[PDB]
């Protein structure tokens, strides 16, 4: 899916608010009505705005909806720890045929400080390279909140092929940890000057680069 | 007073069928429009089948049209959807919900979810690859070192370092599960700059369902 765009995450403090952009095509938004859909962790999918803005039952005026052009925004106000969800944009598709759906954002109420992530990258071992292997590691720790983007490049370029990154999860002491894994041939690793992982968090960037020696 | 409860779900073989059960109570969802959406591990919602009026009719995404095969039971008050010639990429979540119309579309209650596993994955035992020290080895901050641990089946996986001795540092890091459909993770332990040259460190992992140990020296580039 993702044929429409959000952001991956948005935060704000305990009553404070938030926006979530949902972005689409004169073929969806553009001519059909955006539905907002609620996902807290380990649950299904609740239906919270249908019609662009008509909210469920029990849905309090603080979750809004909007459209215009082929925009759509969910405003959130009085943000409590219980908002604490993955929240979806949908309609449909006269293009494809299809009920579409955004990638989904990450709602974080803050209740400890901002914290960057920690990375350390590791290149292939000399044993892997005997086995004609490579992989390249990643180890992303202490951020908070707990959503990253990942991306690898080979030299400067974008590589897409061979990546595999894990969700955040929960450390011991309350922040969040990832990892993410490239895989190449031999001849790719050493035939690169370097391979670097970039982990962006909350808009800001911290960038690991290793070299074949 | 309503609510969809989804059951089949589990693991099938790549070129395998499997069929999901979707029960409603507290509503008649033969007189409703139905609906599969599905949920790939940490990604967004794909919408799958929807099955409409008295016929009745049945609608499927490209993805699945000519392999799937949405149906219902007015009897039972279940939803169905039979799932042919599945691919790894079929992997996911799979709800059943409720789809209805106003202006627009919308799919206002949800089932609990179930699991679909689609992989040949057999009980593998994993390839252990040292971590060496940056050579970079800087007189301020300290040096992270660790253990890869590569292409397993299924979870868990046992790691300690120097046979319990050292968890001073240690962060023993979630799997990934790959397109594979194998597990891989990595241990890195942040020990102290200097002696580096005289500490032996031995990364010890033990993958019970294989039956496989091993322990794995980790000393810097020569």
């Known amino acids: 899916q993702s044929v429409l765009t959000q952001p991956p995450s948005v935060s704000a403090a305990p009553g404070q608010k938030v926006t979530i952009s949902c972005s689409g095509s004169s073929s969806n938004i553009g001519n059909h009505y955006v539905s907002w859909y609620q996902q807290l962790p380990g649950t299904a999918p609740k239906l919270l705005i249908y019609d662009n803005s008509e909210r469920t039952a029990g849905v309090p005026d603080r979750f809004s909806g909007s459209k215009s052009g082929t925009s759509a925004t969910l405003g959130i106000t009085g943000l409590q720890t219980g908002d604490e969800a993955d929240y979806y944009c949908?309609?449909?598709?006269?293009?494809?045929?299809?009920?579409?759906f955004g990638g989904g954002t990450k709602l974080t109420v803050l209740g400890q400080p901002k914290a960057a992530p920690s990375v350390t990258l590791f290149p292939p071992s000399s044993e892997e390279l005997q086995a004609n292997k490579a992989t390249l590691v990643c180890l992303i720790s202490d951020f908070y909140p707990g959503a990253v983007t990942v991306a690898w490049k080979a030299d400067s370029s974008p590589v897409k092929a061979g990546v595999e990154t894990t969700t955040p999860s929960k450390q011991s002491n309350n922040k969040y940890a990832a990892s993410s894994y490239l895989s190449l041939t031999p001849e790719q690793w050493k035939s690169h000057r370097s391979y670097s992982c970039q982990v962006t968090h909350e808009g800001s960037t911290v960038e690991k680069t290793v070299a074949p020696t | 007073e309503v609510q969809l409860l989804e059951s089949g779900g589990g693991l099938v073989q790549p070129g395998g069928s499997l069929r999901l059960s979707c029960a409603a109570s507290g509503f008649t969802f033969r007189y409703e429009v139905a609906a599969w959406v599905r949920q790939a591990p940490g990604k967004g919602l794909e919408w799958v089948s929807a099955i409409s009026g008295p016929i009745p009719k049945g609608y499927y995404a490209d993805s699945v049209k000519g392999r799937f095969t949405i149906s219902r039971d007015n009897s039972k008050n279940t939803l169905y959807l039979q799932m042919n010639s599945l691919r790894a990429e079929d992997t996911a979540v799979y709800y059943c919900?409720?789809?209805?119309?106003?202006?627009?579309?919308?799919?206002?209650?949800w089932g609990r979810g179930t699991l679909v596993t689609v992989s040949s994955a057999s009980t593998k035992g994993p390839s252990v690859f040292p971590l060496a020290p940056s050579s970079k080895s800087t007189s301020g901050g300290t040096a992270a070192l660790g253990c890869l641990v590569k292409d397993y089946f299924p979870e868990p996986v046992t790691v300690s370092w120097n046979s319990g001795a050292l968890t001073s540092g240690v962060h023993t890091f979630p799997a990934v599960l790959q397109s594979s459909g194998l597990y891989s993770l990595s241990s890195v332990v942040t020990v102290p700059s200097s002696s580096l040259g005289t500490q032996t460190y031995i990364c010890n992992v033990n993958h019970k369902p294989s039956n496989t140990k091993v322990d794995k020296r980790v000393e810097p580039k020569s």
């Open positions: 919900a409720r789809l209805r119309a106003d202006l627009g579309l919308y799919m206002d209650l």
């Open positions: 949908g309609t449909w598709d006269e293009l494809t045929s299809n009920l579409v």
